Short mmCIF file of C-alpha atoms and ligand atoms in Angstrom, two decimals:
data_model
loop_
_atom_site.label_atom_id
_atom_site.label_comp_id
_atom_site.label_asym_id
_atom_site.label_seq_id
_atom_site.Cartn_x
_atom_site.Cartn_y
_atom_site.Cartn_z
CA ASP A 21 118.80 57.16 108.60
CA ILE A 22 115.35 56.23 107.38
CA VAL A 23 115.20 57.25 103.72
CA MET A 24 111.79 58.29 102.38
CA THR A 25 111.04 58.34 98.65
CA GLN A 26 107.85 59.03 96.75
CA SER A 27 106.39 58.30 93.33
CA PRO A 28 105.50 59.81 91.01
CA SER A 29 107.42 63.07 91.18
CA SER A 30 104.50 64.65 89.34
CA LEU A 31 101.38 63.93 87.35
CA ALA A 32 98.18 65.51 86.10
CA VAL A 33 94.57 64.37 86.36
CA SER A 34 91.20 65.71 85.17
CA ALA A 35 88.70 66.71 87.87
CA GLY A 36 86.51 63.86 89.09
CA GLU A 37 89.14 61.21 88.38
CA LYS A 38 91.05 58.98 90.78
CA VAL A 39 94.64 59.59 91.85
CA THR A 40 97.04 57.10 93.44
CA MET A 41 100.46 58.13 94.75
CA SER A 42 103.07 56.11 96.60
CA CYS A 43 105.55 56.38 99.47
CA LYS A 44 108.38 54.06 100.41
CA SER A 45 110.47 53.82 103.56
CA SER A 46 113.93 52.21 103.64
CA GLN A 47 112.85 50.42 106.82
CA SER A 48 109.61 49.40 108.51
CA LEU A 49 107.67 52.18 110.23
CA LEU A 50 105.59 49.63 112.16
CA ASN A 51 105.61 49.36 115.96
CA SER A 52 104.75 45.69 116.47
CA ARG A 53 103.69 46.36 120.07
CA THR A 54 101.11 49.05 119.31
CA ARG A 55 100.42 47.93 115.75
CA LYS A 56 100.76 51.54 114.52
CA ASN A 57 102.64 52.62 111.41
CA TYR A 58 104.36 55.97 112.03
CA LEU A 59 103.62 57.52 108.63
CA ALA A 60 101.72 60.72 107.84
CA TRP A 61 100.70 62.60 104.70
CA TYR A 62 100.77 66.39 104.33
CA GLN A 63 99.19 68.62 101.70
CA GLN A 64 100.93 71.80 100.62
CA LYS A 65 98.94 74.07 98.31
CA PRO A 66 100.80 76.81 96.39
CA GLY A 67 101.86 79.61 98.74
CA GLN A 68 100.48 77.90 101.84
CA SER A 69 102.02 76.05 104.78
CA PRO A 70 101.88 72.25 104.82
CA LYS A 71 98.62 70.80 106.16
CA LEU A 72 98.20 67.44 107.91
CA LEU A 73 95.95 65.03 105.99
CA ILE A 74 96.52 61.55 107.38
CA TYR A 75 98.48 60.05 110.32
CA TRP A 76 99.16 56.50 111.56
CA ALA A 77 99.15 55.60 107.82
CA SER A 78 95.34 55.53 107.53
CA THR A 79 93.68 57.89 110.04
CA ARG A 80 92.16 61.01 108.47
CA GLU A 81 92.79 64.28 110.30
CA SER A 82 89.55 65.84 111.48
CA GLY A 83 88.19 68.15 108.78
CA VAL A 84 89.74 66.19 105.94
CA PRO A 85 87.30 64.98 103.25
CA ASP A 86 86.88 61.23 102.82
CA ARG A 87 87.93 61.30 99.17
CA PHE A 88 91.40 61.28 100.74
CA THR A 89 92.33 57.71 101.74
CA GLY A 90 95.56 56.50 103.31
CA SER A 91 96.66 52.87 103.22
CA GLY A 92 99.67 50.57 103.35
CA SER A 93 101.92 49.13 106.03
CA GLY A 94 105.52 48.46 106.98
CA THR A 95 107.51 50.09 104.19
CA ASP A 96 104.97 50.79 101.46
CA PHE A 97 102.19 53.34 101.66
CA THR A 98 99.57 54.84 99.37
CA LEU A 99 97.61 58.06 99.33
CA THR A 100 94.47 57.81 97.21
CA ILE A 101 92.21 60.67 96.16
CA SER A 102 88.93 59.79 94.49
CA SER A 103 86.97 62.39 92.51
CA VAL A 104 89.89 64.82 92.59
CA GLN A 105 88.83 68.46 92.71
CA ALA A 106 90.55 71.47 91.16
CA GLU A 107 91.27 72.68 94.71
CA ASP A 108 93.31 69.51 95.27
CA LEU A 109 96.20 70.95 93.26
CA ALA A 110 99.20 70.62 95.60
CA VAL A 111 102.42 68.92 96.55
CA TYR A 112 101.77 65.86 98.73
CA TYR A 113 104.44 64.74 101.19
CA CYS A 114 104.67 61.56 103.21
CA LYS A 115 106.67 61.67 106.42
CA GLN A 116 107.97 59.00 108.79
CA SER A 117 108.03 59.76 112.51
CA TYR A 118 109.15 56.30 113.66
CA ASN A 119 112.73 57.48 114.23
CA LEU A 120 112.75 61.25 114.56
CA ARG A 121 111.07 62.62 111.42
CA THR A 122 111.94 62.46 107.74
CA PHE A 123 109.98 63.86 104.79
CA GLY A 124 109.69 62.27 101.36
CA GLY A 125 110.49 64.33 98.26
CA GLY A 126 106.84 65.00 97.47
CA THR A 127 104.44 64.34 94.62
CA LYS A 128 103.24 67.31 92.59
CA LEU A 129 99.58 66.85 91.62
CA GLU A 130 98.32 68.96 88.75
CA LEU A 131 94.94 69.05 87.06
CA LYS A 132 94.04 68.53 83.43
CA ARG A 133 91.43 70.84 81.91
CA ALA A 134 90.31 71.86 78.41
CA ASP A 135 92.72 74.00 76.37
CA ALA A 136 92.35 77.74 76.88
CA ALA A 137 93.75 80.72 75.02
CA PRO A 138 95.84 83.26 76.95
CA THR A 139 94.55 86.80 77.56
CA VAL A 140 97.36 89.12 76.57
CA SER A 141 97.93 92.64 77.87
CA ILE A 142 100.90 94.92 77.17
CA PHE A 143 101.97 97.91 79.29
CA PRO A 144 104.39 100.72 78.36
CA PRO A 145 107.01 101.99 80.85
CA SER A 146 105.72 104.36 83.53
CA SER A 147 106.86 107.97 83.51
CA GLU A 148 108.19 107.39 87.04
CA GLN A 149 110.51 104.65 85.80
CA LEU A 150 111.51 106.67 82.74
CA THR A 151 112.38 109.62 84.96
CA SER A 152 115.12 107.45 86.47
CA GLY A 153 116.65 106.37 83.16
CA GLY A 154 115.16 102.90 82.77
CA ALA A 155 112.33 101.48 80.67
CA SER A 156 110.48 98.23 81.33
CA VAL A 157 107.73 96.99 79.04
CA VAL A 158 105.47 94.34 80.57
CA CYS A 159 103.33 91.63 79.03
CA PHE A 160 100.82 89.56 80.97
CA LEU A 161 99.47 86.38 79.43
CA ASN A 162 96.71 85.20 81.70
CA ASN A 163 94.62 82.09 82.22
CA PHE A 164 95.82 79.71 79.53
CA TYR A 165 96.08 75.92 79.31
CA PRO A 166 98.24 73.95 78.75
CA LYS A 167 101.31 75.45 80.45
CA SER A 168 103.46 75.25 77.31
CA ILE A 169 103.80 78.64 75.63
CA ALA A 170 106.46 80.86 74.03
CA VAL A 171 106.60 84.67 74.05
CA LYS A 172 108.51 86.70 71.47
CA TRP A 173 109.30 90.39 71.77
CA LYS A 174 109.65 92.51 68.65
CA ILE A 175 111.05 96.05 68.51
CA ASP A 176 110.11 97.76 65.24
CA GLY A 177 109.34 94.33 63.79
CA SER A 178 112.60 92.63 64.78
CA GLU A 179 112.97 90.16 67.65
CA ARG A 180 114.61 91.35 70.83
CA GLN A 181 116.11 88.50 72.81
CA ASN A 182 118.00 89.92 75.80
CA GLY A 183 116.68 92.15 78.57
CA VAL A 184 113.82 89.67 78.84
CA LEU A 185 112.80 88.02 82.11
CA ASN A 186 109.89 85.57 82.38
CA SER A 187 107.84 84.07 85.21
CA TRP A 188 105.01 81.53 85.42
CA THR A 189 102.50 81.19 88.24
CA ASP A 190 101.55 77.87 89.79
CA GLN A 191 98.31 76.41 88.46
CA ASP A 192 95.18 78.30 89.60
CA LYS A 193 93.37 76.39 92.35
CA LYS A 194 90.05 77.54 90.89
CA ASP A 195 90.09 77.32 87.11
CA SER A 196 93.16 75.10 86.66
CA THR A 197 94.76 77.55 84.21
CA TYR A 198 98.26 79.03 84.16
CA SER A 199 99.51 82.61 83.77
CA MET A 200 102.80 84.10 82.66
CA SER A 201 104.56 87.44 82.92
CA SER A 202 107.21 88.70 80.54
CA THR A 203 109.22 91.86 81.18
CA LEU A 204 111.50 93.57 78.65
CA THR A 205 113.92 96.00 80.29
CA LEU A 206 115.77 98.71 78.32
CA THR A 207 117.56 101.94 79.15
CA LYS A 208 115.54 105.09 78.42
CA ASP A 209 118.05 105.80 75.65
CA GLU A 210 117.37 102.43 73.97
CA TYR A 211 113.60 102.67 74.40
CA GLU A 212 113.64 106.13 72.83
CA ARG A 213 115.44 104.88 69.69
CA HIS A 214 112.47 102.84 68.54
CA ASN A 215 108.72 103.08 68.14
CA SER A 216 106.79 99.82 67.88
CA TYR A 217 106.91 97.43 70.82
CA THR A 218 105.32 94.03 70.41
CA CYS A 219 104.56 91.04 72.63
CA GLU A 220 103.75 87.81 70.75
CA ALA A 221 102.36 84.64 72.32
CA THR A 222 102.71 81.19 70.75
CA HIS A 223 100.15 78.71 72.13
CA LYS A 224 98.61 75.55 70.67
CA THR A 225 95.14 77.16 70.91
CA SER A 226 95.95 79.47 67.96
CA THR A 227 97.77 78.89 64.65
CA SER A 228 99.01 82.49 64.51
CA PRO A 229 100.78 84.47 67.25
CA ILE A 230 98.59 86.37 69.75
CA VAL A 231 99.82 89.93 69.51
CA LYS A 232 99.63 93.06 71.64
CA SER A 233 101.60 96.21 70.98
CA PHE A 234 101.75 99.96 71.31
CA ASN A 235 103.76 102.73 69.67
CA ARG A 236 106.00 104.98 71.72
CA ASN A 237 105.01 107.89 69.48
CA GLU A 238 101.35 107.27 70.29
CA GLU B 7 92.48 78.40 118.82
CA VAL B 8 95.99 77.10 118.30
CA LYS B 9 98.34 79.75 116.88
CA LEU B 10 102.00 79.56 115.83
CA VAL B 11 103.86 82.59 114.44
CA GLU B 12 107.50 82.49 113.26
CA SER B 13 109.70 85.61 113.29
CA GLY B 14 113.33 86.59 112.85
CA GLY B 15 113.86 85.66 109.22
CA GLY B 16 116.01 87.98 107.14
CA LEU B 17 119.26 88.41 105.21
CA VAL B 18 122.44 87.07 106.79
CA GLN B 19 125.99 86.84 105.42
CA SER B 20 127.53 83.43 104.87
CA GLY B 21 129.19 82.10 108.03
CA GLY B 22 127.07 84.42 110.17
CA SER B 23 124.39 83.58 112.73
CA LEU B 24 120.66 84.12 113.13
CA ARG B 25 118.01 83.17 115.68
CA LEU B 26 114.38 82.51 114.78
CA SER B 27 111.45 82.60 117.18
CA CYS B 28 108.04 80.95 117.20
CA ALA B 29 105.33 82.46 119.37
CA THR B 30 102.58 80.08 120.39
CA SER B 31 99.14 80.29 121.99
CA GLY B 32 95.87 78.41 122.38
CA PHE B 33 97.22 75.26 124.00
CA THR B 34 99.30 74.06 126.95
CA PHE B 35 102.76 74.63 125.45
CA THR B 36 104.76 72.58 127.98
CA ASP B 37 102.63 69.55 127.17
CA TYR B 38 103.86 69.37 123.56
CA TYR B 39 106.99 68.53 121.59
CA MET B 40 107.82 71.26 119.05
CA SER B 41 109.54 70.90 115.65
CA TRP B 42 111.29 73.11 113.14
CA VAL B 43 110.99 72.20 109.47
CA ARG B 44 112.39 74.14 106.51
CA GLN B 45 111.82 74.42 102.76
CA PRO B 46 114.26 75.91 100.22
CA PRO B 47 112.62 77.75 97.32
CA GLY B 48 111.06 75.10 95.08
CA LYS B 49 112.37 72.14 97.09
CA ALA B 50 111.07 69.55 99.55
CA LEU B 51 110.27 70.01 103.21
CA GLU B 52 113.12 69.02 105.54
CA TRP B 53 112.63 68.22 109.24
CA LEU B 54 115.46 69.81 111.27
CA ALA B 55 114.86 69.37 115.00
CA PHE B 56 112.47 68.86 117.86
CA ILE B 57 112.40 69.49 121.59
CA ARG B 58 110.37 67.26 123.88
CA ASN B 59 107.66 68.23 126.37
CA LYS B 60 107.83 68.65 130.15
CA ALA B 61 107.19 64.99 130.99
CA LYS B 62 110.12 64.14 128.73
CA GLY B 63 112.51 66.66 130.26
CA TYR B 64 112.54 68.98 127.25
CA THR B 65 115.33 66.95 125.59
CA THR B 66 116.33 67.77 121.99
CA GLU B 67 117.06 65.97 118.70
CA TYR B 68 118.50 67.14 115.39
CA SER B 69 118.76 65.95 111.81
CA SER B 70 122.30 65.12 110.62
CA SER B 71 122.20 68.16 108.34
CA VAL B 72 122.13 70.68 111.22
CA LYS B 73 123.35 68.83 114.31
CA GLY B 74 126.34 70.63 115.81
CA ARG B 75 125.29 73.79 114.00
CA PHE B 76 121.72 74.70 115.01
CA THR B 77 120.33 74.72 118.54
CA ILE B 78 116.64 74.29 119.32
CA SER B 79 115.31 75.65 122.62
CA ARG B 80 112.10 76.81 124.30
CA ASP B 81 110.91 79.37 126.85
CA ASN B 82 108.13 77.80 128.87
CA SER B 83 107.12 81.03 130.60
CA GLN B 84 106.34 83.14 127.50
CA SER B 85 105.56 80.00 125.47
CA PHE B 86 108.21 80.60 122.78
CA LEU B 87 110.13 78.17 120.55
CA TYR B 88 113.58 79.14 119.27
CA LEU B 89 116.14 78.03 116.74
CA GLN B 90 119.65 79.43 116.91
CA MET B 91 121.42 78.89 113.62
CA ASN B 92 125.19 79.22 113.30
CA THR B 93 127.84 79.15 110.58
CA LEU B 94 125.21 79.69 107.93
CA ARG B 95 125.52 78.51 104.32
CA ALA B 96 123.69 79.31 101.08
CA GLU B 97 122.00 75.92 101.40
CA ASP B 98 120.35 77.08 104.62
CA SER B 99 118.39 79.63 102.57
CA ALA B 100 114.75 78.65 102.99
CA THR B 101 111.42 79.26 104.63
CA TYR B 102 111.50 77.94 108.21
CA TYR B 103 108.33 76.58 109.80
CA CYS B 104 107.68 75.85 113.45
CA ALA B 105 105.13 73.10 113.96
CA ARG B 106 103.39 71.64 116.98
CA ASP B 107 104.58 68.09 117.53
CA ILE B 108 103.23 65.26 119.70
CA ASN B 109 101.96 64.97 123.24
CA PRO B 110 102.52 61.23 123.86
CA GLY B 111 101.14 61.46 127.41
CA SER B 112 97.83 62.78 126.07
CA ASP B 113 94.84 60.46 125.99
CA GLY B 114 94.36 61.91 122.52
CA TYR B 115 97.97 61.34 121.43
CA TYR B 116 98.39 60.96 117.70
CA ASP B 117 101.76 61.11 115.98
CA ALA B 118 102.04 64.00 113.53
CA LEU B 119 102.84 67.69 113.07
CA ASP B 120 99.28 69.03 113.32
CA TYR B 121 99.62 72.83 113.31
CA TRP B 122 102.13 74.88 111.31
CA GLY B 123 102.99 78.57 111.35
CA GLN B 124 103.07 80.71 108.20
CA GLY B 125 106.85 80.44 108.06
CA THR B 126 109.69 82.94 108.16
CA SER B 127 112.09 83.32 105.23
CA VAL B 128 115.89 83.24 105.51
CA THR B 129 118.41 84.20 102.84
CA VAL B 130 122.12 83.49 103.27
CA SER B 131 124.06 85.75 100.94
CA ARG B 132 126.74 88.43 100.77
CA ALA B 133 124.61 90.64 98.50
CA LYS B 134 123.31 93.95 99.86
CA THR B 135 119.75 94.79 100.97
CA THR B 136 117.99 96.93 98.34
CA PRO B 137 114.43 98.29 98.48
CA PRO B 138 112.17 97.71 95.47
CA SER B 139 111.04 100.36 93.01
CA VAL B 140 107.29 100.03 92.44
CA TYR B 141 105.87 101.14 89.10
CA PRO B 142 102.25 101.20 87.94
CA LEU B 143 101.10 99.21 84.92
CA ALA B 144 98.30 100.99 83.07
CA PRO B 145 97.19 100.33 79.47
CA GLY B 146 98.56 102.70 76.84
CA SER B 147 95.38 102.51 74.75
CA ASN B 148 86.17 96.16 76.73
CA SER B 149 84.29 94.33 79.50
CA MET B 150 87.30 93.59 81.74
CA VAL B 151 90.53 95.55 82.13
CA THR B 152 93.86 94.30 83.50
CA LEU B 153 96.13 96.56 85.53
CA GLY B 154 99.33 95.74 87.39
CA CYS B 155 102.33 96.74 89.43
CA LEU B 156 105.97 96.11 88.62
CA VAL B 157 108.16 95.57 91.64
CA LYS B 158 111.71 95.93 90.45
CA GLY B 159 115.24 95.61 91.76
CA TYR B 160 115.02 94.43 95.35
CA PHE B 161 117.01 92.10 97.57
CA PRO B 162 116.42 89.82 99.28
CA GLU B 163 113.12 88.00 98.98
CA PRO B 164 110.37 88.16 99.90
CA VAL B 165 107.93 90.94 99.10
CA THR B 166 104.17 90.87 99.49
CA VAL B 167 101.57 92.40 97.20
CA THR B 168 97.85 93.01 97.75
CA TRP B 169 95.25 95.10 95.93
CA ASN B 170 93.03 97.63 97.67
CA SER B 171 94.34 96.24 100.97
CA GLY B 172 93.20 92.73 100.11
CA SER B 173 89.65 93.71 99.24
CA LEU B 174 90.59 92.84 95.64
CA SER B 175 91.62 89.19 95.79
CA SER B 176 89.77 87.48 92.95
CA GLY B 177 91.28 88.20 89.55
CA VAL B 178 94.79 88.72 90.92
CA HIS B 179 97.98 87.03 89.73
CA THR B 180 101.25 87.66 91.54
CA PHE B 181 104.11 86.11 89.63
CA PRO B 182 107.09 84.39 91.27
CA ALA B 183 110.05 86.76 91.53
CA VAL B 184 112.96 86.31 89.12
CA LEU B 185 116.60 86.90 90.08
CA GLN B 186 119.01 88.80 87.83
CA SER B 187 122.33 90.37 88.83
CA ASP B 188 121.72 90.04 92.57
CA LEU B 189 118.34 91.75 92.23
CA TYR B 190 114.82 90.34 92.13
CA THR B 191 111.94 91.56 90.03
CA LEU B 192 108.31 90.47 90.20
CA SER B 193 105.00 91.65 88.86
CA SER B 194 101.36 91.38 89.87
CA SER B 195 98.23 91.71 87.72
CA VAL B 196 94.67 92.43 88.75
CA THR B 197 91.67 92.21 86.45
CA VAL B 198 88.52 94.22 87.12
CA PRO B 199 85.43 95.27 85.12
CA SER B 200 86.27 98.35 83.03
CA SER B 201 83.15 99.94 84.47
CA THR B 202 84.84 100.07 87.87
CA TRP B 203 88.15 101.58 86.74
CA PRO B 204 89.06 104.38 86.69
CA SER B 205 85.78 105.42 88.33
CA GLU B 206 86.83 103.44 91.41
CA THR B 207 90.41 103.50 92.70
CA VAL B 208 92.80 100.60 92.20
CA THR B 209 95.95 100.58 94.33
CA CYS B 210 98.67 97.98 94.85
CA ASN B 211 100.16 97.53 98.33
CA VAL B 212 103.77 96.40 98.28
CA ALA B 213 105.84 95.59 101.38
CA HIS B 214 109.53 94.62 101.52
CA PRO B 215 110.23 93.70 105.18
CA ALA B 216 114.02 93.45 104.76
CA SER B 217 114.11 97.19 104.04
CA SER B 218 110.91 97.96 105.99
CA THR B 219 109.52 99.36 102.72
CA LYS B 220 105.77 99.92 102.45
CA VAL B 221 104.28 101.38 99.29
CA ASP B 222 100.84 102.22 97.95
CA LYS B 223 100.76 102.89 94.22
CA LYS B 224 97.50 104.05 92.66
CA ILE B 225 96.91 102.97 89.06
CA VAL B 226 95.63 106.03 87.18
CA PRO B 227 94.76 106.08 83.44
CA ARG B 228 97.62 107.02 81.07
C1 LIG C 318 103.79 55.51 122.40
C2 LIG C 318 105.06 56.05 122.60
C3 LIG C 318 106.01 55.31 123.31
O1 LIG C 318 107.36 55.76 123.58
C4 LIG C 318 107.38 57.04 124.28
C5 LIG C 318 106.22 57.33 125.27
O2 LIG C 318 106.53 57.88 126.35
O3 LIG C 318 105.05 57.08 124.93
C6 LIG C 318 107.33 58.16 123.21
C7 LIG C 318 108.52 58.13 122.24
O4 LIG C 318 108.37 59.21 121.28
C8 LIG C 318 109.46 59.47 120.35
C9 LIG C 318 110.66 60.20 120.96
O5 LIG C 318 111.77 60.02 120.39
O6 LIG C 318 110.46 60.91 121.97
C10 LIG C 318 108.89 60.34 119.22
C11 LIG C 318 107.75 59.57 118.52
O7 LIG C 318 107.23 60.32 117.41
C12 LIG C 318 108.37 58.29 117.97
O8 LIG C 318 109.39 58.63 117.05
C13 LIG C 318 108.96 57.46 119.11
C14 LIG C 318 109.62 56.15 118.64
O9 LIG C 318 108.80 55.44 117.71
C15 LIG C 318 109.97 55.32 119.88
O10 LIG C 318 110.61 54.09 119.53
O11 LIG C 318 109.95 58.20 119.83
C16 LIG C 318 109.81 58.19 123.07
O12 LIG C 318 109.80 59.37 123.87
C17 LIG C 318 109.84 57.00 124.02
C18 LIG C 318 111.20 56.66 124.68
O13 LIG C 318 112.32 56.93 123.80
C19 LIG C 318 111.22 55.20 125.16
O14 LIG C 318 110.18 54.98 126.09
O15 LIG C 318 108.68 57.08 124.91
MG1 LIG C 319 93.05 83.60 86.98
MG1 LIG C 320 117.97 97.36 68.70
ZN1 LIG C 321 117.98 61.38 122.27
#
């Protein structure tokens, strides 16, 4: 029962800045005989497997850039990244291997960038979906920052609330932006009762909603 | 080149059993400890078990959370790592990774999990397997154009999406699936120069391993 804990749970940093994150062990990970601390750091980028960064508390895995520095001893450990890059977006885990192996809870590192307006696209239901009695209308809102955004759907001017399912990507490892998808699902009967379908994005980059629509009777 | 490839993930009813495999190559298997680690959707990594190398008699250890319930083993002739999982619960739903552990008798011994497979996904649920429906997303009516595919109504996770067999990778966004009424839905967008569509073909490739579904859906104007 060695308990690992990390801090912070999450934070955000602009490219080129310095990042410090911490790891604590409920007991010492130090072998007094060999003088080694059994503590390693792993990087897990969105959609990838974990990757070994540092072991023995301070030894960099071969191939790992030197902006990544591991320090600490006994029960307290620190991973430092200087001149953080956009590609550094990831969850960082520390792990003891002094007594079996135990992972910490991770630190989610995000990157601050300049605000950016979403690019909004709307898509009517496909005839192949319609042919089966259902009707989904999709709205992509791509490459915005910051993450915080609200999408409203309007059917013939009035807000539709249910039938809506939303999903946000992880931050882009390249441009540090976010993207969101919003899908409105109706029966073909419902969809055929109305004409104007509207997707409206609220984002701090614009004082008025960002709107895309189409008419069924187009 | 060290390679580790997990297999055997899938849908399994609560209380049931399932055995994962991990095929290895590019190193002297019997020299190394091997570990299994898992990761529930959106949660932390959790170490589950290891099995020691030849010098150590291939003995095993387990985390409290699976001891008595999972069994880790290895086949030293075909160089495979296994994990038999029994009496499965919803909380066992996760991606499972095999990872090469230490060789303490090595002159280059360092203590870490240095190579990891791509992971195999496991879902523990009573819900039924259901293939996805894949619908094209084309504009109804400048510079760049965004197209997409809607992958609707499948169970369980995961599904994979690529565009033009991976040759379109830049400008793609595949959104995390969302669950609703025992069925997942996800979408993917791809953005290309309007000069290259529809003059060039754009097709999404969707696979759903649980139902062995493979789909190619061309996005044509309309
Ligand atoms: C330098 C290692 C010394 O002890 C060893 C050895 O033969 O070198 C290795 C030990 O490794 C483990 C283990 O449980 O097998 C895993 C390691 O990652 C680490 O956790 C150590 C632990 O710090 C030992 O206190 O254990 C182990 O095999 C060990 C025997 O248990 C005792 O000799 O032998
Ligand atoms: Mg992008
Ligand atoms: Mg209505
Ligand atoms: Zn033991």
